[PDB]
């Protein structure tokens, strides 16, 4: 609540969870994909399309990537000043 110097800071610290999260469902709905099969029989195609957490966790590394030097170089901050 302080000067809007932190107070906007909401954004970053709010919009950091939200674009990570949105990867997260990911995890969350492989637990579908695989209880779906159950229904239509597709226990082949479970194991295989879990490859993509993997292959997705690897691209994900460059959203952190620009969030590595924000988090660390008060370079965000320091345009405020």
């Known amino acids: 609540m302080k000067d809007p110097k932190t107070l906007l800071r909401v954004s970053i610290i709010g919009t950091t969870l939200v674009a990570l999260s949105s990867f997260t469902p990911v995890l969350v ?5 695989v209880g779906l099969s159950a229904l239509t029989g597709y226990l082949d195609y479970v194991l295989l ?4 957490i993997f292959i997705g966790l690897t691209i994900y590394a460059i959203q952190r990537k620009r969030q590595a030097d924000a988090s660390s170089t008060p370079k965000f901050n320091g345009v405020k000043k």
């Open 29 to 33: 709905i492989l637990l579908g994909v």
């Open 49 to 52: 399309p879990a490859l993509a």
